[PDB]
């Protein structure tokens, strides 16, 4: 459309606030002037008391509502005004816009409406729910800010509800924010913060808004009022969660423009009270002066005042209001000095002589000032220059109405509540900083000054005196007379305004603002007044809605802001893209001139004078001048100050620049403009250094990163670096300083000295020990440093931080911030950098921070660390780390070529049947498996593919199944992923594609080991996770099926390089070392991810260099377009919240119809995240938009959800995953976004594995989760990561993937470099390398030192260690290095071994198994797990014994600990049988035993920790059979027994003592006390009472049927061969037979339990006596066993003895046979 360029200067309001939209102004009533020569009077009355309406009432406290009378005592009766709003306020959510006098008692309004809110959470209970709510109120005025405050604070104390100034500052205002209910602060303020783009972290609870003086709409500041309301309009509708606004305003024209604004129904919520309305009826005298000259217009000013002040005697009391601090006491004494006259009436003021109050006044002498001269008189003055025990003094005097006359400043109007009758207002001039000049008034001033007439309870009338020059007589009428229309400034601020919504991405165009400026108050008074705003009548008529007015200010504004560099604008589309200046601008509110200026004068170079001009030049600055007056001041201050100012003359730049130094220095200032420029400047200065500091910082420029954080530092502790530290301490004597300073020696040496030697070296032994105390409350850290190296071009640095400082809640409050910045060898560039924040709680504990450095190959000596406090001054350290002996890994070879074959046809494949897996989904392959089709699927050699996710690498797998196939129709492939969930995949998959189809066997492995062999028995295909194949093939020299292998395929085997990535190196080697142990060779082939490295992984599993296919990840099939989004912000929560619309505008831009996955971080984010997709569709007034069926087809579906908000959410069109959902579930929402019926879903991170689903777009939103053990944020897996871009890939449908990651910025260049170039992994396994030796060991595969030696070198281990010798500690790839090295290795392991009475080693040589370790490699459990057990268990072991045994177990060092999960387990540990002592919540063995207690008694949990009880259940088992075993080898009966009884109450999910019948389905607790009992008795199989007795479903009749026909049936005979021949020392014989009727099928049913287990039993001899076992076997049943058992016997043949048969599984089947022997 149409654009033209504005001249914005033609269309604003000059005057700002002053302008006067008015024309003529009519005086009220009867209303007169008087023409006094020196000037003219304009008397206007008090207006009448318009009488009540119909059933209209002041109300008394006791009729409002119960809860909120409280803050309202001291009242007995509401305000009329209050009265008639006091429905509309407490008994209605709607918006309100109060239009009232000034004095009318607005605060009681606001608190209404408060009260209503905090109504809602009153909580009977308790006191009140504090968490539930915010109430954001906005003044306009810092010293009304801190009124309201005091205020509100007293009245809502009863509430137990904190109210709080927000005080500028990064992260302070973050937490205070958190507590606090109430948060009272000025529009800019609240602008600043919800302009952050996290904004919702403070936002997202704030139910209620109030907006004091919502008139400053006028004002020059209006527009700020305009963005707040606009945004958080707009935010209502983006949320849909409500929030209530209520304006208050002096009763003005326009108003009902500001009610359209605030969207407050006229009909409800709009009150609007005249002047007559006011509490206590104002009488108004407008003096004004005639003519021009000097000081004769100041004598006719005092001369007015003097003569009103004659007409209140003895009588009232009189408020006299002046622009000057010194202008209070230059005043007060010019009228009492007045007052001495012809008679004097110099104390006519106080005749009540007779001592009354004066002495009180003369009592008060102990004061200081000018008050000491006019107190005695009834003389006040009252000013922000004076201190609080003055100001409260005068204060104090004045309310108790000693002080009678009583000379001031706007501060007091402002600040505190203290109405005189009487108002008088010097002048009206006042001077403006930011204007330069003298200017008129603020209308916000004279309303609020004017205010304080007339005293509520005190005055049957107000009186006013506003004393002004002649013209602009009219303009103060029209203020207070209801004549001065409130207008839109917003022109004036617009592209800054503009910026701000940019940056926000609340306007990604032009487009979107139009429809921005919609919500200003600015559209409305366009609309109504077009003529004043600039617009024709007939430009109207035809264009109502302003559509060409609008897009014509905001292309103009765009211009303005494309120009200046803070947005990309193309004048075509009209589309914003926001910068890093824009971006910066906006968050440190600073204008769009100041950001081109800056970007024009910054430099790496820049020099500190060159610095201090630069700030000298922001264009907020750019009224400033040098007044000749004050020439004289500013030479002399140049002298004092310490930084050169560069031969600039005095300019205005010099003069800002100078006065920024005397700020800095302390200084005291005379003149009272030099002052007020001064204050000016430096309010603003540490917002704009601070925006400074962020360009250069994030530019990467050192050098002048530490100086602008210097001056920032600087400015807000007012000192130079060249003094002292120490003055960072309030507390401290300032002389006690300066004789430290003086003495000029290193700060830094104060550290080491004790208080006796640091008293002597300051010459002040008294200070010594304070001095001591406070160097060492000062903030320091120490650094170390581990290098890594990663590839030539980058290190890993583990920075160690150990704080060594004492904390004091009062020095240091509740957290320390630093940056952490890595330079380069000449301290010239910056390049890496993060934040960092030391907690209070986990201060003395030590911090790692991970990051990645990027060198180049011409390697410096060194790079430095630095860690600098984002506060305090020479707060600092640093640490050089030294590149000197380093060796950088070593070149790895060029990725393989990708040929362009032919894309070869399915037809290659000859076998037809073979093709019709393949010919339905597509005619030919991709070029990945074209060029890798020969080999893999006609060569038999060992292969190696590497490939980025979703290349299609698992049918080249497929490829090789079917060559093996072929050869042998009967062979066995043996079929491994790290990851369970792929595993099933790959099953699905794979079984229909064999088993189906192909009609071989396909099979998975189980957690159990017979099953486990008996199934790689059947197997054509055996799918498998790493650890299953290892406790399966461990003992292959023993397992011919396991020799025995035609094909073995490895897949993603760069998890070799992740976590739990030894075990699959381990059984890769060991498959390779099978493979050359025996005859028939087994092929491997090798699936993998780029990798950077790829010939080491394929000689590590003899892959040829022809059968070695690496490809480059930018030649994955379907191209994909990455994009990588960085966000800075280190708060977690804050950065997420923030990334809600990036995600929101990523799905439109780069995915708009087609289909898109978004991973989460956490479960409740996927919720969230999809709720936000949700509305944010809404608000675009597109809904549904992501639904691509009916509504109305769904329903079928969603009817299986269990998950309302589910439900819900799919309706509009997006999914979600997460573990909390059933796999029913979790299949439904894939089958849904499969079909194209819904185009979005959000998913969990612990997903990613486990879905099968593609998109277009992925977006992965974060990349970092909650370590509760490390109290910390830490980095997903870049094999996670990878997975997750994988994702993004349709062959079929797509001509390109497309993914988005957002992530935190110090992330941003990691992901840069792993992600578009191929992956380096190198080997974990020697820091797990003692359970697989143990293992070879018992197998005796390493018989001795030498073997274990040999072992090693089939590792990828091996091969990495001369490739990347540093990485894993080695400081030479010499072979005498690795030999040494790996010699070391071996050592300690077995050394290890040994000590834990795994291994027993002879002569140093030769090493053999004993029985723990024979115990661990069996049972599959880490050694100082069964080292621990032998340590920890004995004879008197018993079963809560054996459960907190258990659950210190290695095993469980893994379990993680999520976000406050320490108060769920200390919930969960108050509701367990057994409780713990002492327990620390983030302890994962702790959480373990609370986990177990919780299985035992069947509590229900989160999804989280009940995942977390599955996986702890899987290995309960194995840890408590090897308790057995270790109890049973010291010859213990009893804890033995106990441990069985664990076993079986574990897995059928019930206690020791309890009911037997629990085990039974559906059977809960108190559902039958029926007989008053045993499962065994209980079916005598009947048929009976179940109708009787029980409560009858018809389902668990068929479950419980099901359950008895499984439940174990046993009896059992047994002999003792050969009775009475057996004598002393001689061999014993018991012979047991299992026999059985009803026999098996079908595993153990125990529905609680995750796997699917064998029935399995123990026969034990034992004396239950002397508590010794005397014999023990395991077994398992089936149809029949042979049990014989073998003991010696005692002398003296009488011996009784007792037989257990005892099971693992169930309970109630345990049986004794008491016997004897001999
Ligand atoms: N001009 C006054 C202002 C102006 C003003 C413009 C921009 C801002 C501002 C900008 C950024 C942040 C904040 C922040 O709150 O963090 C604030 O703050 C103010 O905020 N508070 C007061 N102001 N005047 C005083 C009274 C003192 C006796 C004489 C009459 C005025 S109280």
Redesign the pocket.
């Known amino acids: 459309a149409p654009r033209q360029v504005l001249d914005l200067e033609d269309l604003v309001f000059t005057q700002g606030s002053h302008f006067m939209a008015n024309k003529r102004c009519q005086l009220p009533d009867g209303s007169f002037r008087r023409q006094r020569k020196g000037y003219e009077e304009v008397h206007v009355p008090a207006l009448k008391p318009k009488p009540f309406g119909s059933e209209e009432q002041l109300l008394p406290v006791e009729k409002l509502p119960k809860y909120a009378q409280a803050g309202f005592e001291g009242f007995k009766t509401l305000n009329r005004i209050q009265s008639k709003l006091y429905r509309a306020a407490l008994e209605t959510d709607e918006n309100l816009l109060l239009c009232a006098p000034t004095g009318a008692g607005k605060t009681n309004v606001a608190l209404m409406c408060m009260l209503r809110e905090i109504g809602k959470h009153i909580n009977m209970d308790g006191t009140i729910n504090v968490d539930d709510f915010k109430i954001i109120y906005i003044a306009?005025?810092?010293?009304?800010?801190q009124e309201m405050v005091g205020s509100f604070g007293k009245r809502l104390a009863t509430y137990g509800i904190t109210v709080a100034e927000?005080?500028?500052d990064h992260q302070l205002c973050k937490e205070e924010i958190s507590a606090t209910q109430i948060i009272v602060?000025?529009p800019?303020?609240w602008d600043?913060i919800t302009r952050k783009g996290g904004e919702r972290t403070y936002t997202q609870l704030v139910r209620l808004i109030i907006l004091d003086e919502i008139h400053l709409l006028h004002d020059d500041?209006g527009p700020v009022l305009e963005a707040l309301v606009a945004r958080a309009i707009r935010n209502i509708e983006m949320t849909q969660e409500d929030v209530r606004l209520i304006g208050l305003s002096a009763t003005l024209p326009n108003y009902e423009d500001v009610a359209t604004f605030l969207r407050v129904d006229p009909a409800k919520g709009l009150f609007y009270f005249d002047n007559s309305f006011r509490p206590v009826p104002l009488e108004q005298t407008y003096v004004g002066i005639t003519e021009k000259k000097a000081i004769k217009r100041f004598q006719i000013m005092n001369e007015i005042v003097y003569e009103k002040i004659m007409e209140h005697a003895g009588k009232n009391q009189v408020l006299v209001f002046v622009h000057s601090r010194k202008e209070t006491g230059k005043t007060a004494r010019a009228i009492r000095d007045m007052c001495l006259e012809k008679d004097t009436l110099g104390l006519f003021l106080r005749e009540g002589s007779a001592s009354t109050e004066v002495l009180r006044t003369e009592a008060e002498q102990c004061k200081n000032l000018e008050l000491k001269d006019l107190l005695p008189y009834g003389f006040a003055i009252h000013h922000?220059g004076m201190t609080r025990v003055d100001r409260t003094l005068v204060e104090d005097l004045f309310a108790d109405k000693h002080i009678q006359v009583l000379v001031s400043?706007?501060?007091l109007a402002?600040?505190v509540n203290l109405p005189a009758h009487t108002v008088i207002i010097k002048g009206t001039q006042v001077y403006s900083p930011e204007k330069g000049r003298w200017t008129e008034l603020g209308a916000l001033?004279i309303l609020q000054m004017l205010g304080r007439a007339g005293r509520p309870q005190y005055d049957t009338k107000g009186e006013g005196i506003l004393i002004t020059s002649h013209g602009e007589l009219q303009y103060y009428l029209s203020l207070l007379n209801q004549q001065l229309p409130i207008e839109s400034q917003m022109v004036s601020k617009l592209p800054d305004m503009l910026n701000a919504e940019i940056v926000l991405g609340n306007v990604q165009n032009a487009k979107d603002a139009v429809n921005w400026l919609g919500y200003a108050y600015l559209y409305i008074r366009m609309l109504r007044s077009p003529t004043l705003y600039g617009i024709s009548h007939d430009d109207l008529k035809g264009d109502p809605l302003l559509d060409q007015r609008r897009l014509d200010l905001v292309h103009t504004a765009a211009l303005m802001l494309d120009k200046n560099n803070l947005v990309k604008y193309d004048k075509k589309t009209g589309n914003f893209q926001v910068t890093e200046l824009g971006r910066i601008a906006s968050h440190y509110?600073i204008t769009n001139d100041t950001v081109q200026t800056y970007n024009q004068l910054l430099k790496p170079t820049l020099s500190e004078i060159e610095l201090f001009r630069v700030f000298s030049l922001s264009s907020e600055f750019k009224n400033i001048t040098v007044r000749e007056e004050e020439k004289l001041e500013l030479q002399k201050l140049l002298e004092r100050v310490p930084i050169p100012v560069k031969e600039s003359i005095e300019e205005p730049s010099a003069k800002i620049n100078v006065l920024l130094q005397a700020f800095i220095s302390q200084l005291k200032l005379e003149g009272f403009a030099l002052m007020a420029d001064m204050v000016y400047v430096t309010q603003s200065a540490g917002?704009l250094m601070r925006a400074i500091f962020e360009i250069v910082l994030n530019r990467g420029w050192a050098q002048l990163t530490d100086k602008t954080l210097n001056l920032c530092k600087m400015i807000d502790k007012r000192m130079w670096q060249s003094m002292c530290p120490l003055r960072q301490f309030r507390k401290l004597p300032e002389e006690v300083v300066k004789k430290i300073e003086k003495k000029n020696f290193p700060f830094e040496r104060l550290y080491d000295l004790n208080h006796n030697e640091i008293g002597e070296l300051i010459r002040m032994p008294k200070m010594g020990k304070t001095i001591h105390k406070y160097v060492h409350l000062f903030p320091k850290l120490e650094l170390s440093v581990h290098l890594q190296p990663i590839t030539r071009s980058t290190l890993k640095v583990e920075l160690t931080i150990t704080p060594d400082f004492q904390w004091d809640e009062k020095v240091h409050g509740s957290s320390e911030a630093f940056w952490i910045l890595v330079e380069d060898v000449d301290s010239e560039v910056i390049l890496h950098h993060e934040y960092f924040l030391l907690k209070a709680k986990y201060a003395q504990d030590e911090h790692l921070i991970t990051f990645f450095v990027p060198v180049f190959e011409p390697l410096p000596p060194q790079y430095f660390i630095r860690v600098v406090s984002d506060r305090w001054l020479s707060c600092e350290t640093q640490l050089p780390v030294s590149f000197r002996h380093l060796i950088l890994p070593e070149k790895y070879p060029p990725p393989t070529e990708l040929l362009d074959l032919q894309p070869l046809p399915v037809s290659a494949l000859r076998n037809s049947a073979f093709e019709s897996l393949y010919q339905d989904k597509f005619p030919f392959f991709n070029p990945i498996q074209t060029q890798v089709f020969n080999t893999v699927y006609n060569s038999d050699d060992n292969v190696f593919v590497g490939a980025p996710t979703g290349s299609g690498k698992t049918i080249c797998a497929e490829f090789a199944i079917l060559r093996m196939l072929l050869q042998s129709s009967e062979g066995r492939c043996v079929y491994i992923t790290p990851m369970e969930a792929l595993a099933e995949q790959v099953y699905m998959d794979w079984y229909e594609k064999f088993q189906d189809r192909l009609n071989k066997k396909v099979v998975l492995l189980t957690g159990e080991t017979s099953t486990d062999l008996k199934l790689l028995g059947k197997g054509n295909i055996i799918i498998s996770t790493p650890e299953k194949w290892d406790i399966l093939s461990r003992r292959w020299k023993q397992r011919k099926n396991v020799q025995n292998i035609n094909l073995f395929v490895v897949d993603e085997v760069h998890l070799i390089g992740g976590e739990n990535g030894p075990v699959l190196e381990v059984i890769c080697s060991r498959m390779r070392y099978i493979s050359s142990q025996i005859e028939r060779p087994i092929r491997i082939v090798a699936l993998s991810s780029s990798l950077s490295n790829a010939k080491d992984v394929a000689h590590w599993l003899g892959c040829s260099a022809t059968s070695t296919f690496n490809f480059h990840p930018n030649v994955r099939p379907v191209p994909l377009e990455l994009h990588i989004q960085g966000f800075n912000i280190s708060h977690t929560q804050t950065r997420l919240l923030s990334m809600a619309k990036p995600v929101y505008h990523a799905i439109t831009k780069h995915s708009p119809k087609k289909p898109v996955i978004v991973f989460v971080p956490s479960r409740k984010q996927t919720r969230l995240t999809a709720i936000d997709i949700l509305t944010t569709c809404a608000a675009d007034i597109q809904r549904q938009r992501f639904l691509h069926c009916t509504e109305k087809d769904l329903i079928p579906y969603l009817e299986k959800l269990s998950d309302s908000t589910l439900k819900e959410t799919l309706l509009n069109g997006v999914g979600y995953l997460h573990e909390g959902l059933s796999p029913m579930e979790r299949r439904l929402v894939e089958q849904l976004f499969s079909s194209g019926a819904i185009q979005v879903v959000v998913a969990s991170r612990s997903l990613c594995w486990g879905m099968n689903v593609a998109a277009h777009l992925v977006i992965i939103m974060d990349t970092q989760y909650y370590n509760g053990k490390i109290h910390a944020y830490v980095d997903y897996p870049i094999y996670d990561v990878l997975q997750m871009v994988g994702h993004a890939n349709r062959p079929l449908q797509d001509d390109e993937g497309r993914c988005v990651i957002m992530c935190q910025g110090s992330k941003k260049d990691f992901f840069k470099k792993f992600l578009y170039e191929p992956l380096p992994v190198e080997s974990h396994l020697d820091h797990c390398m003692h359970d697989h030796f143990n293992a070879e060991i018992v197998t005796k595969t390493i018989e001795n030192k030498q073997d274990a030696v040999d072992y090693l070198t089939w590792t990828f281990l091996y091969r990495r260690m001369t490739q990347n010798p540093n990485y894993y500690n080695l400081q030479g790839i010499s072979h005498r290095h690795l030999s040494d090295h790996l010699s070391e290795l071996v050592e300690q392991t077995l050394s290890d071994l040994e000590q834990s009475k795994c291994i027993s080693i002879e002569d140093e040589m030769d090493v053999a198994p004993l029985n723990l370790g024979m115990i661990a490699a069996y049972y599959y459990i880490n050694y100082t797990t069964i080292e621990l057990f032998s340590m920890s268990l004995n004879a008197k072991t018993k079963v809560r014994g054996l459960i907190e045994i258990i659950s210190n177990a290695a095993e469980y060092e893994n379990i993680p600990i999520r976000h406050h999960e320490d108060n769920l387990l200390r919930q969960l540990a108050q509701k367990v049988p057994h409780k713990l002592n002492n327990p620390k919540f983030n302890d994962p063995h702790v959480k373990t035993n609370l986990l177990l207690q919780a299985h035992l008694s069947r509590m229900q949990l989160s999804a989280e920790l009940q995942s977390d009880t599955e996986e702890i259940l899987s290995k309960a088992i194995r840890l408590i059979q090897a308790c057995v075993d270790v109890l049973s080898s010291n010859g213990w009966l009893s804890p033995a027994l106990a441990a069985m009884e664990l076993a079986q109450m574990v897995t059928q999910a019930m206690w020791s003592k309890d009911s037997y019948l629990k085990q039974l389905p559906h059977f809960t607790s108190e559902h039958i006390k029926r007989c008053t009992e045993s499962v065994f008795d209980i079916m005598e199989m009947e048929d009976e009472e179940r109708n009787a007795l029980l409560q009858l479903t018809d389902s668990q009749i068929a479950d419980v049927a099901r359950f008895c026909n499984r439940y174990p049936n046993i009896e059992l005979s047994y002999e003792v061969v050969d009775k009475d021949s057996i004598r002393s020392g001689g061999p014993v014989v018991v012979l047991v037979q299992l026999e059985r009727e009803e026999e098996v099928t079908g595993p153990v049913i125990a529905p609680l339990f995750p796997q699917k287990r064998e029935e399995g039993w123990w026969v034990v001899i034992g004396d239950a006596k002397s508590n010794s076992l005397i014999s023990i076997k395991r077994l398992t049943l089936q149809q029949k066993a042979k049990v014989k058992l073998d003991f010696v016997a005692p002398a003296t043949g009488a011996h009784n003895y007792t037989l257990y048969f005892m099971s693992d599984a169930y309970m109630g089947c345990d049986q004794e046979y008491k016997f004897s022997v001999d």
């Open positions: 306009p005025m810092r010293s009304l800010v927000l005080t500028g602060c000025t800019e303020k600043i500041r922000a400043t706007a501060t402002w600040g001033d509110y917002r």
